[PDB]
Structures are given as structure tokens and as C-alpha cells.
Design a protein around this ligand. Structure first.
Ligand code: FMN
Ligand code: J9R
Length: 389
């Protein structure tokens, strides 16, 4: 009578041993760039989740009792939640540190502010910003700041007996109300000369109109004297605090925190369910998974939210394109869940079939995380150590 359990137990043991091997390779090479360069704590949380997926088999195969019924209810949702919260936090981290995007609008005649913007654009590019540099002469005011996390306005000072903004910049300055500067993080720069009474008067003028509109001036204006090439060290130095506006780093403790919050969401659903509907029997558990689908809905949200963010952040090259492999993991995950959920529905009337299918789908969900995400990571660590130094 235990024949039906041989196949699922074999998968579960092979899968558990693979997950342990992956953890072993990772912990042995813990300070290595492949393991350190991304969400290290998140990849250990993820492995724990994959280990729990395989272990769920032993709970499905077990004879129903108060303890087994508790474990099943609590575990099915939790196992998945650990995986999909670690994965969502990984893509969320990628989306903040590389998702960030900046816009540079400059007004230049002799190419001085046009050079300042080029060297600023390079420094921001180096900080994982999708930088877009645009001359003011070829800029239309209406909704120009929309979609941008950071906006840098560059302008030289002109006018003989008084201050005057650079020729190309004036229309943009005149219709500044229309760009969407309210609540936007901004910073001004510009080239001028100290032989002139009002050194960089254009910067002061732009800073002040931005202030009235309700813009968030992150840093004080960069006012350069003479040739910008000789003040290059201060330009790049100014770029060090403008890049700071949108965080370029989420701390290891913060990653763990947001991941633990999302897992806690599942816990609260399935613990609250257990206290309302007391676990027990009388062959079968008292409260089936179909009696309350709130645990499943939460994991479907996590999968949906994750797959959205994974696709949006796919082209990121950080940590040997881990973003691409999270993509594959997630596209494969959707396919498993879209194929199995209808099977469970149309098969709900045969318990041994439900149990057996659950052993296959939960383990397959684990195997996909090991195959798409970890196997490529493993191949570099073990067979390409020169690429891991
Ligand atoms: C007609 C004229 C007016 C200027 N007025 C000012 C001024 O009031 N304040 C200032 O700091 N620089 C002033 N300058 C200096 C220019 O801003 C400087 O040459 C600048 O580096 C040009 O930058 P751009 O290539 O970005 O246009 C003036 C220069 C000229 C010839
Ligand atoms: C890949 N994979 C996901 C799971 C899984 C996961 C979860 C969860 N807690 O996150 N809860 C499940 C509940 C059930 C019960 N069905 C009874 C009849 O059908 C119903 C519906 F609506 F889905 F059709 C639901 C079945 C499978 C569940 C297993 N494998």
C-alpha cells in the first residue's frame, strides 16, 4: 500500500540532496563575487524555501493526524512564500539600484556646460542610472520631467549689464510650470566667470524658480569658474552627492527585513486560518486547501508581482546577468502554476491523485529555482573559477 509514495519520496530525496549540495558550494565560496555580488542573504533564504518545497512531500505522504494536518496547512503556503518573497526582494533590489533613471537638460554656446553634462552623464551611468542627455534647443517643456527619478538642469550665464540665461534654455525656463517639477528631485549646474559681478546668476535663477514650483533640490548648484576641464575634479565630486538622491545600495539587513515582511503576510493568513479552523481528522484532514484559498491568492500575487518586475529588469548585466535567470525562473513558475492549478480543480474528487500531484508540482517548483537560477551560478563557481576572482 506504499507503492504510490516511492516516486514522490525519490524526487524529494534527490531534490533535498541537490539543494544541500548547492548550499555547500555557496557556503564554501561565501566571500566569492558570485555569492557576494547580489542578494546573498536572499539566496540563502531562497535555498531554505526550495529545501522546504521538497520536504513538503514527507508531509503529504504522512498519515493525517492533528500534527500532519497543522503542518500541511501551515507548510504549503509558507514553503512557496519563502521562495517567492526572496525572489520578489531580489528583483525589487535590482529595480531600485538600476531601475533609477536620470535626465540632463543643458544650455550651452561654447560647449562648456555641454562638456560638464557629458562628464556628469558618465558618472551617473557608472552609478547604474539610465541617463538621457538632451540639449535645451531640442527640448519641449510640456511633461518633460515625467518618468524621471532625477533631473539635472545645466545653464551658462549671459547678458551684458545684467543676468540672462543661455539662449536655448530661456523657452524651457519660461514654461518650467509644465515640466512636472513639483515633488521632483532636481539639481542645477552651470559654467560662468568670476570677472563678472554675478558669477553663475543663471543657476541661482533656475534654483529659485524650481523652489517656487515645489521641486526637491537635492544638492546646491554646481557653479564652475572658467574652463570646466580644469574644474573636472569638482564636477565628478559634485556627481558623488547627486547620485546619492536615489539609493544605489540597499543594506543586507534591509533586504532580509522586507523579505521577512512578505513571508509574514502568508504566516498571518495561514496561522489565522488554523486558529479559526482547528486542525484534525474525522483518512483525511478536517479543513482542505479548497475550504480557504487566501493562502493560494497571496502566492499568486507574489508570482504576478515578481514576474512583472523580473521582466522589467531583464536587461540588467549585474552578477553575470542574474536578472535574466530570475526571468527564466519566473516565466517557468507561471507555466507550472497555470498548468497545475486547473488539474487540481478537475481532479479535486480523488484524494490520492491530489496528494501525488501536489508532490510533483511543489517539487517541480523547487527544481525550476535550482535549474534556472542556481545551476548557472554553480557552473561559474565550479568550472570557471578565473571568472570568480
Ligand atoms: C556677453 C557675455 C556675458 C556673460 N555674462 C556672464 C555673467 O553675468 N556671469 C558669469 O558668471 N559669466 C558670464 N559670462 C561668461 C560665460 O558664461 C562663460 O564664457 C561660459 O563658460 C560659457 O558657457 P557655455 O559654453 O556653457 O555657454 C558672460 C560671457 C559673455 C561673453
Ligand atoms: C505549483 N503548485 C501550487 C500549489 C498550491 C499552492 C497553494 C498555496 N498555499 O500557495 N495552495 C494550493 C491549493 C490547492 C487546492 N485546489 C483545490 C481545487 O482547485 C483549487 C483551484 F482554485 F486552484 F483550482 C485549489 C491546490 C494547489 C495549491 C500546488 N502546486
Amino acid at each position: 500500500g506504499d507503492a504510490w509514495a516511492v516516486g514522490p519520496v525519490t524526487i524529494a530525496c534527490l531534490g533535498a540532496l541537490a539543494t544541500l549540495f548547492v548550499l555547500g558550494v555557496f557556503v564554501r565560496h561565501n566571500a566569492t563575487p558570485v555569492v557576494k555580488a547580489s542578494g546573498r542573504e536572499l539566496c540563502y533564504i531562497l535555498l531554505g524555501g526550495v529545501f522546504l518545497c521538497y520536504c513538503m512531500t514527507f508531509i503529504f505522504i504522512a498519515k493525517p493526524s492533528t500534527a500532519v494536518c497543522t503542518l500541511r496547512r501551515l507548510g504549503l503556503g509558507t514553503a512557496f512564500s519563502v521562495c517567492y518573497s526572496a525572489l520578489l526582494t531580489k528583483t525589487y533590489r535590482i529595480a531600485r539600484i538600476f531601475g533609477a533613471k536620470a535626465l540632463i537638460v543643458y544650455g550651452s554656446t561654447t560647449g562648456n556646460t555641454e562638456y560638464t553634462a557629458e562628464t556628469i552623464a558618465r558618472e551617473l551611468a557608472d552609478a547604474g542610472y539610465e541617463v538621457d542627455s538632451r540639449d535645451a534647443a531640442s527640448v519641449e517643456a510640456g511633461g518633460l520631467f515625467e518618468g524621471f527619478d532625477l533631473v539635472l538642469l545645466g545653464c551658462s550665464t549671459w547678458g551684458d549689464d545684467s543676468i540672462e540665461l543661455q539662449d536655448d534654455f530661456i523657452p524651457l525656463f519660461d514654461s518650467l510650470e509644465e515640466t512636472g517639477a513639483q515633488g521632483r528631485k532636481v539639481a542645477c549646474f552651470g559654467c560662468g566667470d568670476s570677472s563678472w559681478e554675478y558669477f553663475c546668476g543663471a543657476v541661482d535663477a533656475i534654483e529659485e524658480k524650481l523652489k517656487n514650483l515645489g521641486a526637491e533640490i537635492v544638492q546646491d548648484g554646481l557653479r564652475i569658474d572658467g574652463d570646466p576641464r580644469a574644474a573636472r575634479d569638482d564636477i565628478v565630486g559634485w556627481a558623488h552627492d547627486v547620485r546619492g538622491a536615489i539609493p544605489r545600495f540597499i543594506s543586507p539587513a534591509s533586504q532580509v527585513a522586507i523579505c521577512l515582511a512578505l513571508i509574514s503576510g502568508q504566516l498571518l493568513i495561514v496561522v489565522a486560518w488554523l486558529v479559526v479552523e482547528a486542525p484534525g481528522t474525522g483518512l483525511r484532514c478536517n479543513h482542505r486547501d479548497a475550504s480557504m484559498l487566501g493562502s493560494l491568492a497571496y502566492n499568486v500575487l507574489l508570482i504576478a508581482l515578481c514576474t512583472l518586475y523580473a521582466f522589467k529588469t531583464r536587461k540588467c548585466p549585474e552578477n553575470f546577468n542574474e536578472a535574466k535567470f530570475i526571468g527564466f525562473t519566473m516565466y517557468t513558475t507561471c507555466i507550472i502554476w497555470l498548468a497545475f492549478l486547473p488539474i487540481f480543480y478537475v481532479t479535486s474528487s480523488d484524494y490520492r491523485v491530489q496528494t501525488t500531484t501536489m508532490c510533483v508540482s511543489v517539487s517541480l517548483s523547487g527544481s525550476v529555482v535550482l535549474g534556472c537560477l542556481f545551476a548557472p551560478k554553480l557552473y561559474i563557481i565550479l568550472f570557471q573559477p578565473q571568472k570568480n576572482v
